[PDB]
Amino acid sequence: SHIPFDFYLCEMAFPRVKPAPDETSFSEALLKRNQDLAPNSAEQASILSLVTKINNVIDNLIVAPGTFEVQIEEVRQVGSYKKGTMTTGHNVADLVVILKILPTLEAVAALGNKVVESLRAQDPSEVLTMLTNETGFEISSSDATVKILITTVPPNLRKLDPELHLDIKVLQSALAAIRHARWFEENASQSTVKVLIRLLKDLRIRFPGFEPLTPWILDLLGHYAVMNNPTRQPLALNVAYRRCLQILAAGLFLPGSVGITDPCESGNFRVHTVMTLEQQDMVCYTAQTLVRILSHGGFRKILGQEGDASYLASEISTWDGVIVTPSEKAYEKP
Amino acid sequence: IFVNDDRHVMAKHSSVYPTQEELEAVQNMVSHTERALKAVSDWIDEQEKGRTLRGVMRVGLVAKGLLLKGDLDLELVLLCKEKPTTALLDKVADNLAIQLTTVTEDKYEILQSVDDAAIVIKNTKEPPLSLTIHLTSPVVREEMEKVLAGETLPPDVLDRQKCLAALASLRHAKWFQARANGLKSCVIVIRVLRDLCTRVPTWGPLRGWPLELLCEKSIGTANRPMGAGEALRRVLECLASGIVMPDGSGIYDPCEKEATDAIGHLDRQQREDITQSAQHALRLAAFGQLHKVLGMDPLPDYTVQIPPSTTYAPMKRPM
Ligand SMILES: Nc1ccn([C@@H]2O[C@@H](COP(=O)(O)OP(=O)(O)OP(=O)(O)O)[C@@H](O)[C@H]2O)c(=O)n1
Ligand SMILES: [Mg+2]
User: DZF domain: from which residue to which, for each copy (chain B)?
Assistant: First the structure.
């Protein structure tokens, strides 16, 4: 039940001695970096088109399955596509399909076929590739991809078998993707919030220390940063971005902390407990190093506007005369 | 929450807590100096009536109950109706030498520091206790205030700067008794951390008024009462967030009219270093190695140090 320190949870108790500094360049650079990461007009049109085409086919399939063997109960758009946190370069969208029958590898393939086949009949000129996977199946154009995460209905989960029906792990992670999608669209659909989650993905990709951080965790974190605060008002991008580092540094996702509770589970599950102690130490001290680096005015480096910076969190660096030593491991295996 | 941490913090606490022998000694010296000065006052009032010395107040460690094993420096504030002058300084010192004999036979060295606007008293124990009496007057700040505001206004007046500092510490005393004392585990943690600031040169610059503020701010902002273990952690978490870094908010001095930073002296590197240290100290504590931070081996009403003056005889942090 321990809540780690968070300056923006008790801002009143820390009166400012002098007017906040002019973080105009930092804020401007924050947006600049976002424009670079945000999908272009072509990518949006691509994934749009492809997702639109497929979703309809599935929709249709539900109502008038006709002489078709696989009964689909429902379909729901999920993932960055729906959340609005996609990234240039990764033009992939996600859709979860709920089957009324127990999901078999054979039905999954039968379905993937019916869909793609019906897409190639409505537009033979459009080259499409369809491949099945562990999760379900996937259809990709030359410009964009769509992953169909195949699941089932709760009642079946209890009746599922490990030899003929997909793994209960995959089936339930799909179901969770739905919840996450809903929750997000009901609580996280704020401009800055989305812009932050995008930047968070990038940060995690350019600092190997943030690697254990899952996407769901990045959503919940990006939300907390902007929205969770006494005053029912979203924080500025620059303020919530620095706060992301600050809360990780104060050990939000460390042992003994309540961290962040999963809104899409029961009853009170700590999201970060998907990470190992070793990883928790890492996420923390990585964030700690960046907090200090940021205070010394290295937002460009920390944003990826000055090339490779992963070294900033493992090697000594000197910022205007101040010698910076990266925070070091403190966890002790058995 | 964090039971072992409670154990270890409290254990390290004992290690640093004065000795019944030490406290008994401090109690007597202060009790003598108070009764003595009180007598020095009466003598002056009567000697005049044929008010000048307004009162004797406790400050610093003695007031705040922040004495630790190995402390020899005690402090007291003598308020005057007027700005204290070199003359008054002498008058007091000499009569103090005398008025002492009215309450005790223990020998006390007495030395006045006109340049320090105070009088030092030393006992004859080994090692010796040293009580400093700072002379000041509210008039000194009143005028300074006017001075700053560019407002119009004896030959041997004591250093104004020093005097302002005495008034300042008196404020800090009252503040601490009203804000910190009542706050659970604040005092315990301040002592235990005062020890850390001494053992580790890096935490050096934090020692004193800053550290006291830090602890009250971080512990007090909790949504609930904490044990010594949890409370201390929360002080590390606060430090780790970069609260003291240059572009941070700084520590706002609750005892100054013109907005002042309590850690304003810390240069860039010092800030960097403390943060880096506190950040590491946190995770250590988080991963069950708090004893390393405290400087100990893993184990297998603490506020009142000396009774309040009967000569110059209390607010408390709301339940
Ligand atoms: N093993 C999984 C897989 C998915 N999900 C849910 O569905 C995921 C969404 O798809 P994923 O590709 O894993 O993350 P994206 O949101 O798609 O992010 P990006 O497309 O940028 O990689 C997560 O959001 C999560 O809500 C999950 O909980 N557990
Ligand atoms: Mg996706």
Answer: 1-319
Asked whether residue A232 falls in the same domain as residue A333, the answer is yes
How many structural domains are present in chain A?
2
Cβ neighbours of B5 (radius 10 Å): 22
Place of tokens 């009203």: B178
| Residue A317 backbone phi and psi in degrees, to 5 | -140, 145
Using a CB-CB distance cutoff of 8 angstroms, which residues of chain B are in contact with residue A281?
283, 287
Among A158, A173, A190, identify where a domain stops: A190
Q: Strand order of the sheet with strand B109-113? A: B53-58, B73-80, B130-136, B118-122, B109-113
Quick one: A213 and A250 in the same domain?
A: yes
Experimental method: X-ray
- Which fold does the domain B1-15+183-300 belong to in CATH? Poly(a)-polymerase, middle domain (1.10.1410)
State the closest ligand 1 atom to the C-alpha of A264, by its place in the atom list counted from 1.
Answer: 26
| Domain range enclosing A270 | 1-38+191-334
Which ligand lies nearest the alpha carbon of A182? 1
Phi-psi region of A275 (alpha: psi -120 to 50; beta: other; left: phi over 0): beta
- Pocket-forming residues, ligand 1, beta carbon under 6 Å: A 78-80, 87, 92, 94, 173, 176-177, 180, 215-216
Q: Which of B241, B245, B260 sits opposite A250 (nearest CB)?
A: B241
Q: Give the gap in angstroms from C-alpha B65 to the nearest C-alpha of chain A.
A: 24
Residue with tokens 């399939």: A61
Is the separation of the CB atoms in B302 and B14 below 8 Å? no
Q: Is the Cβ pair B238, A5 closer than 8 Å?
A: yes
Every domain range in chain B assigned CATH 3.30.460.10 = 16-182+301-319
Question: A32 and A127 share a domain?
Answer: no
Give the CATH number, domain containing residue A12.
1.10.1410.40
Report the run of H or E that residue B135 belongs to, with start and end: strand B130-136
- The reply to whether residue B243 touches residue A292, judged by beta carbons under 8 angstroms, is no
Pair (A167, A261) in one structural domain: no
Q: What is the resolution of this structure in A?
A: 3.1
Shared domain check, A45 and A26: no
| Secondary structure of residue A104 in the 3-state scheme | strand
In this structure, whether the domain defined by B16-182+301-319 belongs to CATH 3.30.460.10 is answered with yes
Find out whether the peptide bond into B155 is cis, omega within 30 degrees of 0.
Answer: no
C-beta separation of A248 from A285 below 8 A = no
Contact A21 B247 (CB under 8 A): yes
**Cis peptide upstream of residue B50 (ω within 30 degrees of 0):** no
Strands A129-132 and A317-319: unpaired
**Nearest by CB: B279 against A10, A288, A332:** A288
